Write a protein that binds this ligand. Sequence first.
Ligand SMILES: [Ca+2]
Ligand SMILES: [Ca+2]
Ligand SMILES: [Mg+2]
Length: 400
Amino acid sequence: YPRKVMQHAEELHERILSFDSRITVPLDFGTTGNEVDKDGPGQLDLVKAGRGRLSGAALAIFGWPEMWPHKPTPGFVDEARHQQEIRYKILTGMVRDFPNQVGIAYSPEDFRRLAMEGKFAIVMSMLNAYPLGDDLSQLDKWAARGVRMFGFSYVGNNDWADSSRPLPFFNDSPDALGGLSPLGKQAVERLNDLGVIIDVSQMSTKALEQVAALSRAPIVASHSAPRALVDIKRNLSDHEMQLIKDSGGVIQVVGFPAYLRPLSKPTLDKLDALRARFDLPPLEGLDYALMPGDPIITIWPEQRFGEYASALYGILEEEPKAGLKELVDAIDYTVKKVGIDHVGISSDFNDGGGVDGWKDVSEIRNVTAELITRGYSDADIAKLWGGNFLRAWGEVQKRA
Ligand SMILES: [Ca+2]
Ligand SMILES: [Ca+2]
Ligand SMILES: [Mg+2]
C-alpha cells in the first residue's frame, strides 16, 4: 500500500474500535510456550493486539466430538464439556492475571468502556450445541457465567440443529432434523429471553431459515462468506443474507481463504488423484474438496479415514492462500446485497483463518488499508469493524 494509505489506516485506528467476531481459544492458551501477554505462536495475544490496535474479539466457549482418529462414542459429550470448561477457565483467568490489560464485556456498553480504559475486550461467545445434550437450562447457566452470543452449530450435525457440513465420520445424514429439532426451536425462544445473540454461521440452510422465522431479535453470522465467491454449503446464499438483514442483524465476513477463493486446478487435480486411490469418484463442486464429506466414508475403518483425511488436508495446505483482495471482494458483495449497516469482519484466527496480508491480529490495519483503497469512508469502516455488531448486540439485549 502507498504510505499515504497506510498512514490513513493508522490514524483511523488510533481512534476507532475494532472487533473480530471469531477467534478460537487454543486449549493450551496461557501456558508455557503460549502465554497471553507475549508475542507468541498463535494468531492472538496481548502484544499482537496492542500493535494492531484490535479493541476486542469474540472468544468462544467451544467443545465438539474431537477425533484427533477415534469415532465418537457417548462419552465424547462429556469430553466436549471438558473442552468448554477449559476455555472458560482460560478467559476468566486472563482477566484475573491481567486486570489492567483485559476485561470481559457483558454488553456493548462494557465493550466501549473497556476499550476507553485501554483493556482488550473479550466477548464471551459459545459455538456448538453438541456439549449441552438435551438440557435447555444450560443456556441460562452459560448466560449467567458471561456468554453473550451462541451459535448452534459447528462441523457435524447435533441434536439441536443440522450443520451445513455433516460429517460422514460421525455417520451424519444431510438435513437429518429438517433444520431445528423441537428442542432447538425451544432454544431460539430461550436465547431471545436471555438476551443472547443467536449466531447462524455453520448452521444448515433450513436451520437458519427456522431461526429467522422464530427469532424476535437480530441474528448474526459471526464468520461467514458469500456463495457468489465460492459455491459451498458453508457459505451464504443471497436469500440467507436477506434473512439476517431483515432481523436487523449482521454478516461478519470471514477471512477464511478457501471460502473466498475457489481451489486452483493444480489442487483439484491433486485431490482427484487422491480420491481415485480411495475409490471415490472425481469431485463435483467444492464441498467434499474442503473436507472429507463423502457419505460412503461412514463405512470406512478409522485407519482408512485417518490416511485419507491427513492426505486431503496436506494437499489443502499447499493451495496458495487467498488475499486481502478476495476478503474485500466478499465485503463488497455482502454490502451490495444487505447494505453497509449489516456487514462486519471476522478472521477465524486459530481455526485456519487469516489471508495473505492479514495473518494475525496485529495486521488488522492492512484490512483497513484495502477498504480505504476501494473507497470506503471512515464512518463505513467504523461500522464494518464493529459499529454494526455493537448496534445489533444492543437491540438483542433490549428484546430480553
Ligand atoms: Ca465430566
Ligand atoms: Ca480518515
Ligand atoms: Mg496406505
